[PDB]
Scaffold this motif. Structure first.
Motif, mmCIF file in Angstrom:
data_model
loop_
_atom_site.group_PDB
_atom_site.id
_atom_site.type_symbol
_atom_site.label_atom_id
_atom_site.label_comp_id
_atom_site.label_asym_id
_atom_site.label_seq_id
_atom_site.Cartn_x
_atom_site.Cartn_y
_atom_site.Cartn_z
ATOM 1 N N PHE A 1 0.809 -1.207 0.000
ATOM 2 C CA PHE A 1 0.000 0.000 0.000
ATOM 3 C C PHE A 1 0.850 1.269 0.000
ATOM 4 C CE2 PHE A 1 -3.397 -2.940 1.607
ATOM 5 C CZ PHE A 1 -4.118 -2.917 0.450
ATOM 6 N N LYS A 2 1.954 1.256 0.734
ATOM 7 C CA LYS A 2 2.861 2.374 0.667
ATOM 8 C C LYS A 2 3.364 2.637 -0.727
ATOM 9 C CE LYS A 2 7.326 4.073 2.312
ATOM 10 N NZ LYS A 2 8.341 4.049 3.441
ATOM 11 N N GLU A 3 3.765 1.592 -1.417
ATOM 12 C CA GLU A 3 4.216 1.709 -2.826
ATOM 13 C C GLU A 3 3.139 2.295 -3.708
ATOM 14 O OE1 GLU A 3 3.491 0.350 -6.275
ATOM 15 O OE2 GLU A 3 5.375 1.194 -7.344
ATOM 16 N N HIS A 4 1.921 1.804 -3.566
ATOM 17 C CA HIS A 4 0.856 2.368 -4.305
ATOM 18 C C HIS A 4 0.586 3.821 -4.012
ATOM 19 C CE1 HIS A 4 -0.031 -0.753 -6.997
ATOM 20 N NE2 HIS A 4 0.438 -1.554 -6.066
ATOM 21 N N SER A 5 0.740 4.210 -2.749
ATOM 22 C CA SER A 5 0.582 5.594 -2.392
ATOM 23 C C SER A 5 1.616 6.445 -3.129
ATOM 24 C CB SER A 5 0.805 5.819 -0.876
ATOM 25 O OG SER A 5 0.742 7.191 -0.543
ATOM 26 N N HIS A 6 2.850 5.989 -3.184
ATOM 27 C CA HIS A 6 3.911 6.783 -3.811
ATOM 28 C C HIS A 6 3.561 6.831 -5.365
ATOM 29 C CE1 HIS A 6 5.725 6.547 0.222
ATOM 30 N NE2 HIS A 6 6.846 7.120 -0.167
ATOM 31 N N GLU A 7 3.149 5.747 -5.979
ATOM 32 C CA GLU A 7 2.890 5.782 -7.410
ATOM 33 C C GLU A 7 1.744 6.762 -7.710
ATOM 34 O OE1 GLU A 7 4.981 4.487 -9.682
ATOM 35 O OE2 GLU A 7 6.135 4.178 -7.801
ATOM 36 N N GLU A 8 0.716 6.835 -6.885
ATOM 37 C CA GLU A 8 -0.375 7.749 -7.206
ATOM 38 C C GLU A 8 0.081 9.216 -7.069
ATOM 39 O OE1 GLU A 8 -3.251 6.186 -8.631
ATOM 40 O OE2 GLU A 8 -1.595 4.934 -8.481
ATOM 41 N N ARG A 9 0.922 9.519 -6.082
ATOM 42 C CA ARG A 9 1.491 10.884 -5.978
ATOM 43 C C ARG A 9 2.338 11.212 -7.187
ATOM 44 N NH1 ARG A 9 3.112 9.102 -0.969
ATOM 45 N NH2 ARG A 9 5.295 9.926 -1.259
ATOM 46 N N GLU A 10 3.071 10.251 -7.699
ATOM 47 C CA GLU A 10 3.824 10.485 -8.919
ATOM 48 C C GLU A 10 2.863 10.789 -10.114
ATOM 49 O OE1 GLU A 10 6.294 6.854 -9.270
ATOM 50 O OE2 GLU A 10 7.646 7.602 -7.615
ATOM 51 N N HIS A 11 1.739 10.091 -10.192
ATOM 52 C CA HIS A 11 0.820 10.429 -11.237
ATOM 53 C C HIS A 11 0.265 11.836 -11.120
ATOM 54 C CE1 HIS A 11 0.602 6.604 -13.100
ATOM 55 N NE2 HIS A 11 0.092 5.989 -12.024
ATOM 56 N N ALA A 12 0.014 12.241 -9.878
ATOM 57 C CA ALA A 12 -0.475 13.626 -9.671
ATOM 58 C C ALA A 12 0.549 14.618 -10.182
ATOM 59 C CB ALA A 12 -0.762 13.902 -8.177
#
Ligand SMILES: [Cl-]
Ligand SMILES: [Cl-]
Ligand SMILES: [Cl-]
Ligand SMILES: [Cl-]
Ligand SMILES: [Cl-]
Ligand SMILES: [Cl-]
Ligand SMILES: [Cl-]
Ligand SMILES: [Cl-]
Ligand SMILES: [Cl-]
Ligand SMILES: [Cl-]
Ligand SMILES: [Cl-]
Ligand SMILES: [Cl-]
Ligand SMILES: [Cl-]
Ligand SMILES: [Cl-]
Ligand SMILES: [Cl-]
Ligand SMILES: [Cl-]
Ligand SMILES: [Cl-]
Ligand SMILES: [Cl-]
Ligand SMILES: [Cl-]
Ligand SMILES: [Cl-]
Ligand SMILES: [Cl-]
Ligand SMILES: [Cl-]
Ligand SMILES: [Cl-]
Ligand SMILES: [Cl-]
Ligand SMILES: [Mg+2]
Ligand SMILES: [Mg+2]
Ligand SMILES: [Mg+2]
Ligand SMILES: [Mg+2]
Ligand SMILES: [Mg+2]
Ligand SMILES: [Mg+2]
Ligand SMILES: [Mg+2]
Ligand SMILES: [Mg+2]
Ligand SMILES: [Mg+2]
Ligand SMILES: [Mg+2]
Ligand SMILES: [Mg+2]
Ligand SMILES: [Mg+2]
Ligand SMILES: [Mg+2]
Ligand SMILES: [Mg+2]
Ligand SMILES: [Mg+2]
Ligand SMILES: [Mg+2]
Ligand SMILES: [Mg+2]
Ligand SMILES: [Mg+2]
Ligand SMILES: [Mg+2]
Ligand SMILES: [Mg+2]
Ligand SMILES: [Mg+2]
Ligand SMILES: [Mg+2]
Ligand SMILES: [Mg+2]
Ligand SMILES: [Mg+2]
Ligand SMILES: [Mg+2]
Ligand SMILES: [Mg+2]
Ligand SMILES: [Mg+2]
Ligand code: NA
Lengths: 175, 175, 175, 175
Positions: D51-62
């Motif tokens: 979940f942490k990894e996914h959190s970082h990937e979504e911030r990168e998309h933003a």
């Protein structure tokens, strides 16, 4: 009888000697084809080298039959090695046709030896024959047939350009 | 419906299964061309290998459609893979002409699938199709056309020398 | 007849074509098992990959029969590749049971071909069959049986935890 | 208007700002799932890290949407980042179900933006969306669905052993 001998029929022993001789005869035929393609008035050196290689491989097979004979406790009995059928081999197409026939002759002799070994219930001899030969022999027959097809496509015997090209592209670049 | 499914129309799912089948059929056709050029009475081994490579690439495309189907939540439904149209392929020119037509058939099926995806407002499917295919498919069609032009220049079907030369120079040296 | 042909009975040639087809059919079955285990509602990816590997190995065997056919001077004759028996494969245990039966079917076809080759006194074909297959085929049957034993021990079909664990420990970690 | 602006509709510019916000909101949700699985009374650290990894990937998309906005000459307009729906996420199964829904929500927002871009005849925006997203988004949805299937197989929510095992085998070993 030899102290090592077990399950080795006299007829098989004799057939092994005849096969040894046939391999030596095939070697010698291929050596004659090499010499022919090396002539100054033939001069197809990659073709020549192809036949030289084949000559060396058939002599190696003869040596393997010698060793096999001794391993089984049979006795090597040598005969004259008959000179080849022809002194000159025409051209690449005729030589390849002669090679095809020679390879088929050798293959038939191996088939016949395998049948004999089978009939004498000699699985060691069958395995030996199936482990040096049939694979390699069918592959050599195939390659020569492929070459004949290509030589005909290239217009042999008439088309000298085609013959020239075969020597540059079909057989490995040599010496 | 699958828990993953989103924006994936039944008609698209079905068309993906049919495309998978067509790719398998194209693979199988190219495998038949390989086998034909490997025959002893054909014996154009670089041509053979060209078709073998194409056969493997089309099977890889089929596998990509399988994976895609599952990723979208559709269901893989397999059908028989029909044997090729012909058992023998004539010569290099006829085989290349048949390949051209096959590639055009596959391209048309991809175009049709893209139109369907467009009409169903499925940008993911459109992107998938535009990211594995059109580039590669137009390049393959171009290469086969280039080859046909060269085979005609070389005098096919009549000119066997020309055919021979094509196999040495136009297609990558193989196995 | 082909210029290369020697000691190759028409019945053997035909049986080689049928074996080629059966190998293609086995490949296609294993591809269906892969696709099933890759589904989002199945999701056993190491199991999936095991079946994918098997699919690729059976296609490789089909290609070896094609090459063999040509080497002997027979002619490759392709038929449709029939779709697999099932569209869905239940679970790991049912799929492995189906694989066991498929492998036994293929083995029986090889045994039958070997008997035919024996009866036609074709040692080359016998050697070919004994040099690509029996070893590998008995080892594959053994491995699948070992897996079935383990799946039953793990409580399949009911025990999902057991199924999960099999995918992590019994089959090689994949992709 | 910006000197760089060309073919960029106000509605698209606005939708890009809303997507940026949604990505930030998705990031923040995944961060909450991380924190939950890191709790001493939850203690599933590989799940947490997923979940942490996914959190970082979504911030990168933003961040990619921010950059895109400026490249087109639009103006970044930020809004509050809403806290996640829940303060606690139950267990691995419930969290994965919530992730599935979140990913589907994000995917639908991307689909909607692509439809808008299409209607405004903005191929640059369509290409951008088809080049960062659909592939990756369908793959994430697939992976989460695969996980849900496995969690159910493992006996969630009741089977704690199954939950434990999922954290060791399904998600990459972490930190
Ligand atoms: Cl004795
Ligand atoms: Cl005796
Ligand atoms: Cl020896
Ligand atoms: Cl003479
Ligand atoms: Cl002779
Ligand atoms: Cl050579
Ligand atoms: Cl849908
Ligand atoms: Cl639908
Ligand atoms: Cl995919
Ligand atoms: Cl035909
Ligand atoms: Cl077609
Ligand atoms: Cl090429
Ligand atoms: Cl025959
Ligand atoms: Cl016959
Ligand atoms: Cl072979
Ligand atoms: Cl079924
Ligand atoms: Cl079966
Ligand atoms: Cl394995
Ligand atoms: Cl504008
Ligand atoms: Cl505007
Ligand atoms: Cl950007
Ligand atoms: Cl809450
Ligand atoms: Cl949501
Ligand atoms: Cl992971
Ligand atoms: Mg003594
Ligand atoms: Mg004696
Ligand atoms: Mg004399
Ligand atoms: Mg017997
Ligand atoms: Mg035997
Ligand atoms: Mg040899
Ligand atoms: Mg030989
Ligand atoms: Mg002529
Ligand atoms: Mg469901
Ligand atoms: Mg449907
Ligand atoms: Mg039919
Ligand atoms: Mg694109
Ligand atoms: Mg291509
Ligand atoms: Mg193509
Ligand atoms: Mg012409
Ligand atoms: Mg003929
Ligand atoms: Mg027949
Ligand atoms: Mg049917
Ligand atoms: Mg095997
Ligand atoms: Mg097997
Ligand atoms: Mg039980
Ligand atoms: Mg200004
Ligand atoms: Mg505005
Ligand atoms: Mg609030
Ligand atoms: Mg992703
Ligand atoms: Mg995502
Ligand atoms: Mg339960
Ligand atoms: Na596009």
């Amino acid at each position: 009888v030899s102290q090592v001998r077990q399950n080795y029929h006299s007829d098989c022993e004799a057939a092994v000697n005849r096969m040894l001789n046939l391999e030596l005869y095939a070697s010698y035929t291929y050596s004659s084809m090499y010499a022919f393609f090396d002539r100054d008035d033939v001069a197809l050196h990659n073709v020549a080298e192809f036949f030289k290689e084949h000559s060396h491989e058939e002599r190696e097979h003869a040596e393997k039959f010698m060793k096999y004979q001794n391993k089984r406790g049979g006795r090597v009995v040598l005969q004259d090695i008959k000179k080849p059928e022809r002194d000159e081999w025409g051209n690449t197409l005729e030589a390849m046709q002669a090679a095809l026939q020679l390879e088929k002759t050798v293959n038939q002799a191996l088939l016949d030896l395998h049948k004999l070994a089978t009939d004498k219930v000699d699985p060691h001899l069958c395995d030996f024959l199936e482990s040096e030969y049939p694979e390699e022999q069918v592959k050599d027959i195939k390659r020569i047939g492929d070459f004949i097809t290509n030589l005909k496509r290239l217009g042999l015997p008439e088309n000298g350009m085609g013959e020239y090209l075969f020597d540059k592209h079909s057989v490995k670049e040599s010496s």
